[PDB]
């Protein structure tokens, strides 16, 4: 019915946790060389995310909407460890070296996933741009949950500080999903069609990225 | 750098405090219907400024650079009162209804100023976009000092919370000018030409804005 319901339904189906990458993870049938491949190829999207948000902010005249995006941007980039710093710890805890992470070149599948976000966040529909992020960010608390379990059981992650990023995202993205849902409603301009479009795009692209490794 | 020094001389040689509108301010010869013109038209630029910063951030892949742009943006928009809020108080301390300020359609002069900034901030040179901000922001601390003097000497201001915006920008924009100047060096990609070109345009566009109220 109402487009937000349909929007939440698109995610519930094309949801990353049901992609085979995470099935195998949840099961534990995933190689450490695989985990390192995923971790490094993710980095690009880890570094582009602040621009997903600021791409949207920069085209926005709704002052109350812009503050919520700031709050999101601040949670990711401001301070130390910011959300990028936290991913590097998961990279290193996997055994990839710092020079190896800086030397890694992101796949055409990594560049495609980020291009999908960037297409919507710089597109002409601010709601669709926010809907794009929601379709990724509203799945994270669950993935973060089930990811930690996999790390500690089948991957010998004994020190909690190694998966800080995930412990942190396990709650920060409950508030982000909630506030992005608000923003979509605030920035709607007869463009419900584009919100569902972005959702359809982002949930497929997510799946295409995870396809690359399997 | 030399290119930063030429950048500072362009600003030095086209400084807002030498426009007739501030040579009048300083001498007392500014009307009060003139102050409400200014205060109200300035409100487009004020609400706009964060997107100048987020425009550059969204095209930038230098992580250290982006944190300096965030710092700036946080000072500007985060919390209560933020700089937009502080501008509202001062417009109201001028005698303007929250209702007329928000019914006010900004002048063509105002739209022109904001369009100039936005051209560079959406543009292709990240250092030029920063330098466009810098060509304005480096002037603010002194204008803010002098504008506070005028409000209190010739415009009978006594409540320090009215001109809080200028109080706040007298110190905050010292840090912003400093760090923008670092950003320019950090973002340079063989575009010193573009850095100076943005500077010439913005200093002259600010002058154009200052003239709409001089009749
Ligand atoms: Mn994050
Ligand atoms: Mn988030
Ligand atoms: Mn400011
Ligand atoms: Mn500033």
Swiss-Prot record, chain B:
Lineage: Bacteria, Pseudomonadati, Chlamydiota, Chlamydiia, Chlamydiales
GO molecular function: metal ion binding; oxidoreductase activity; toxin activity
Residues of the site described as Side-chain cleavage: 22
Keyword Metal-binding in record: yes
Binding site for Fe(2+) 1: 76, 83, 169
Broad class of the protein's primary localization: secreted
Organism (species): Chlamydia trachomatis serovar D (strain ATCC VR-885 / DSM 19411 / UW-3/Cx)
Effect on the protein of changing residue 147 to R: Retains 2% of PABA synthase activity
Resulting phenotype, residue 83 to A: Apoptotic activity is decreased by more than 60%, but the mutant still binds to death receptors
Name the record gives this protein: 4-aminobenzoate synthase
Signal peptide annotation: none
Keywords: Host cytoplasm, Iron, Metal-binding, Oxidoreductase, Secreted, Toxin, Virulence
